[PDB]
Scaffold this motif. Sequence first.
Motif, PDB file in Angstrom:
ATOM      1  N   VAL C  24       0.866  -1.172   0.000  1.00  0.00           N
ATOM      2  CA  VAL C  24       0.000   0.000   0.000  1.00  0.00           C
ATOM      3  C   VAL C  24       0.904   1.224   0.000  1.00  0.00           C
ATOM      4  N   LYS C  25       0.360   2.351  -0.448  1.00  0.00           N
ATOM      5  CA  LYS C  25       1.100   3.601  -0.487  1.00  0.00           C
ATOM      6  C   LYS C  25       0.323   4.676   0.256  1.00  0.00           C
ATOM      7  N   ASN C  26       1.063   5.608   0.849  1.00  0.00           N
ATOM      8  CA  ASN C  26       0.526   6.756   1.573  1.00  0.00           C
ATOM      9  C   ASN C  26      -0.299   6.357   2.791  1.00  0.00           C
ATOM     10  N   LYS C  27      -0.200   5.107   3.236  1.00  0.00           N
ATOM     11  CA  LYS C  27      -0.880   4.634   4.439  1.00  0.00           C
ATOM     12  C   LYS C  27       0.129   3.866   5.278  1.00  0.00           C
ATOM     13  N   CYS C  28       0.462   4.404   6.449  1.00  0.00           N
ATOM     14  CA  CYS C  28       1.463   3.774   7.299  1.00  0.00           C
ATOM     15  C   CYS C  28       0.968   2.427   7.806  1.00  0.00           C
ATOM     16  N   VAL C  29       1.833   1.417   7.709  1.00  0.00           N
ATOM     17  CA  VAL C  29       1.475   0.036   7.995  1.00  0.00           C
ATOM     18  C   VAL C  29       2.558  -0.604   8.851  1.00  0.00           C
ATOM     19  N   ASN C  30       2.168  -1.665   9.556  1.00  0.00           N
ATOM     20  CA  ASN C  30       3.090  -2.422  10.403  1.00  0.00           C
ATOM     21  C   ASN C  30       3.726  -3.544   9.581  1.00  0.00           C
ATOM     22  N   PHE C  31       4.579  -3.134   8.647  1.00  0.00           N
ATOM     23  CA  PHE C  31       5.169  -4.073   7.707  1.00  0.00           C
ATOM     24  C   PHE C  31       6.219  -4.952   8.382  1.00  0.00           C
ATOM     25  N   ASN C  32       6.475  -6.103   7.757  1.00  0.00           N
ATOM     26  CA  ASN C  32       7.549  -7.016   8.156  1.00  0.00           C
ATOM     27  C   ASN C  32       8.200  -7.492   6.860  1.00  0.00           C
ATOM     28  N   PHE C  33       9.233  -6.776   6.425  1.00  0.00           N
ATOM     29  CA  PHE C  33       9.934  -7.109   5.187  1.00  0.00           C
ATOM     30  C   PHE C  33      11.189  -7.919   5.509  1.00  0.00           C
ATOM     31  N   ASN C  34      10.958  -9.177   5.884  1.00  0.00           N
ATOM     32  CA  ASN C  34      12.025 -10.122   6.208  1.00  0.00           C
ATOM     33  C   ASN C  34      12.861  -9.619   7.388  1.00  0.00           C
ATOM     34  N   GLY C  35      12.183  -9.436   8.523  1.00  0.00           N
ATOM     35  CA  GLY C  35      12.791  -8.978   9.749  1.00  0.00           C
ATOM     36  C   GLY C  35      12.695  -7.481   9.967  1.00  0.00           C
ATOM     37  N   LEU C  36      12.525  -6.713   8.894  1.00  0.00           N
ATOM     38  CA  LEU C  36      12.438  -5.256   8.972  1.00  0.00           C
ATOM     39  C   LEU C  36      11.047  -4.908   9.496  1.00  0.00           C
ATOM     40  N   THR C  37      10.901  -4.980  10.817  1.00  0.00           N
ATOM     41  CA  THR C  37       9.593  -4.840  11.458  1.00  0.00           C
ATOM     42  C   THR C  37       9.411  -3.414  11.983  1.00  0.00           C
ATOM     43  N   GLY C  38       9.310  -2.482  11.048  1.00  0.00           N
ATOM     44  CA  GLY C  38       9.129  -1.076  11.377  1.00  0.00           C
ATOM     45  C   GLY C  38       7.692  -0.629  11.214  1.00  0.00           C
ATOM     46  N   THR C  39       7.522   0.619  10.782  1.00  0.00           N
ATOM     47  CA  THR C  39       6.213   1.192  10.492  1.00  0.00           C
ATOM     48  C   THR C  39       6.407   2.444   9.650  1.00  0.00           C
ATOM     49  N   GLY C  40       5.401   2.757   8.837  1.00  0.00           N
ATOM     50  CA  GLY C  40       5.452   3.959   8.027  1.00  0.00           C
ATOM     51  C   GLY C  40       4.859   3.827   6.639  1.00  0.00           C
ATOM     52  N   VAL C  41       4.815   4.939   5.905  1.00  0.00           N
ATOM     53  CA  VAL C  41       4.271   4.927   4.556  1.00  0.00           C
ATOM     54  C   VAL C  41       5.361   4.552   3.559  1.00  0.00           C
ATOM     55  N   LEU C  42       4.922   4.016   2.422  1.00  0.00           N
ATOM     56  CA  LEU C  42       5.798   3.492   1.382  1.00  0.00           C
ATOM     57  C   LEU C  42       5.613   4.313   0.114  1.00  0.00           C
ATOM     58  N   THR C  43       6.712   4.858  -0.401  1.00  0.00           N
ATOM     59  CA  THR C  43       6.700   5.627  -1.641  1.00  0.00           C
ATOM     60  C   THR C  43       7.778   5.114  -2.587  1.00  0.00           C
ATOM     61  N   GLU C  44       8.025   5.825  -3.686  1.00  0.00           N
ATOM     62  CA  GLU C  44       9.055   5.430  -4.636  1.00  0.00           C
ATOM     63  C   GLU C  44       9.888   6.643  -5.023  1.00  0.00           C
ATOM     64  N   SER C  45      11.080   6.370  -5.538  1.00  0.00           N
ATOM     65  CA  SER C  45      11.991   7.411  -5.997  1.00  0.00           C
ATOM     66  C   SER C  45      12.750   6.873  -7.207  1.00  0.00           C
ATOM     67  N   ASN C  46      13.800   7.586  -7.619  1.00  0.00           N
ATOM     68  CA  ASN C  46      14.579   7.237  -8.801  1.00  0.00           C
ATOM     69  C   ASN C  46      16.005   6.809  -8.462  1.00  0.00           C
ATOM     70  N   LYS C  47      16.295   6.571  -7.187  1.00  0.00           N
ATOM     71  CA  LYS C  47      17.662   6.318  -6.758  1.00  0.00           C
ATOM     72  C   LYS C  47      18.146   4.950  -7.233  1.00  0.00           C
ATOM     73  N   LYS C  48      19.454   4.737  -7.106  1.00  0.00           N
ATOM     74  CA  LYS C  48      20.072   3.473  -7.466  1.00  0.00           C
ATOM     75  C   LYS C  48      20.112   2.542  -6.256  1.00  0.00           C
ATOM     76  N   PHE C  49      20.554   1.309  -6.492  1.00  0.00           N
ATOM     77  CA  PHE C  49      20.586   0.306  -5.436  1.00  0.00           C
ATOM     78  C   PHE C  49      21.448  -0.856  -5.911  1.00  0.00           C
ATOM     79  N   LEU C  50      21.985  -1.611  -4.955  1.00  0.00           N
ATOM     80  CA  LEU C  50      22.698  -2.833  -5.283  1.00  0.00           C
ATOM     81  C   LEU C  50      21.751  -3.821  -5.965  1.00  0.00           C
ATOM     82  N   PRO C  51      22.270  -4.658  -6.868  1.00  0.00           N
ATOM     83  CA  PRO C  51      21.383  -5.587  -7.589  1.00  0.00           C
ATOM     84  C   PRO C  51      20.650  -6.565  -6.687  1.00  0.00           C
TER      85      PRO C  51
END
Lengths: 99, 31, 99, 49
Positions: C24-51
Motif C-alpha cells: 500500500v502507499k501513503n498509508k502507514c502500515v506495520n510491515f515485516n519485510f524479512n525482519g524489517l519490522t518497522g512502520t510507516g508509509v511506502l513511496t518510490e523514488s529514482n535512486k540506485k541500489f545494489l542488484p
Amino acid sequence: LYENQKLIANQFNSAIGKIQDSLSSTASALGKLQDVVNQNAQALNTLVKQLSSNFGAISSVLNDILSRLDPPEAEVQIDRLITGRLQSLQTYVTQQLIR
Amino acid sequence: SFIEDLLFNKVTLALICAQKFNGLTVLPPLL
Amino acid sequence: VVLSFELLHAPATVCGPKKSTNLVKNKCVNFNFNGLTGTGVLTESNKKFLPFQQFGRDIADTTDAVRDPQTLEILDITPCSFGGVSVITPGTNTSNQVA
Amino acid sequence: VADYSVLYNSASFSTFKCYGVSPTKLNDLCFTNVYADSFVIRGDEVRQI
Ligand SMILES: *[C@@H]1O[C@H](CO)[C@@H](O)[C@H](O)[C@H]1NC(C)=O
C-alpha cells in the motif's frame, strides 16, 4: 567636533566600508556564532548517532530484538538497551544544560 | 539592513529531517 | 544437531511459510519485510541500489530504502507522520476551552 | 521454506536449548543463510556445547 564634522563623517563612512569588506572577505571573522551553532548541532549529531550502538545487547534495532526474543528474555535484553540509551540521553541533557 | 544580509548568508545552518523521525525535533524560535 | 543462524542484513533465502500480501502507499502500515519490522508509509523514488540487497540505511542508522523480496522494486519507507501536541490553555479559572 | 513450527513439535527432543531466539518465534524472521551442524555426543556432555 564642529571643527572636524566633515572629516568625522568621512572617516565614519570609510570605516563602514572596511567593515563591509572585512565581513564579506572571510568566514572565520564571525566565529562565536559559528562556534555555538556547530557545537549544538554536533552534540545533537552525537546524540542521534548513539542509537546505532548495541550497548552490549543483541542488536541496536529495537524492533529486531522484539521479533527475535521472547518477552521473558526480551525483558533483560531491552532492560540493558534502555538503560544504555537512558544514560546517553541523560549525559546529553546535562551537557545541554551546561551550555 | 545591508550588513545583516551579509551576516545571514555567511552563517551556514544545518539528516536534519531524519532527526525529526526520532522525536528530537527543533522547536521554532519564538521571535 | 545445532542450527546456527547468522541473522543480519542480506538477501533472505529461507524463512517461514507465512502468507504474503500486496503493498500500500501513503498509508502507514506495520510491515515485516524479512525482519524489517518497522512502520510507516511506502513511496518510490529514482535512486540506485545494489542488484541483490534489500536494505537502505540513513545517517539516522535505520532502514530507509527497501527492495521487495517478491518483485524487485525500489521502495522508500518514511515512518508514519507524527509530531508532538502542545495544549495551549489559559488559567484553569479563566476558562475550560483549550487550544 | 522451513516448517520451523512443526520441527519444534516432535516430542523426541529431550534437550532443546535455543540460545539464539525463542523457539516459537523461529517462524517469522527470515534467515540470511543457515548452518546445520549434525553429530552425536555423550549423554553427559550434552550441555557442554
Ligand atoms: C478566577 O479566574 C480569574 C481569571 O483571571 C483569576 O483572576 C482569579 O484569581 C480566579 N479566581 C480565584 C479565586 O483564583
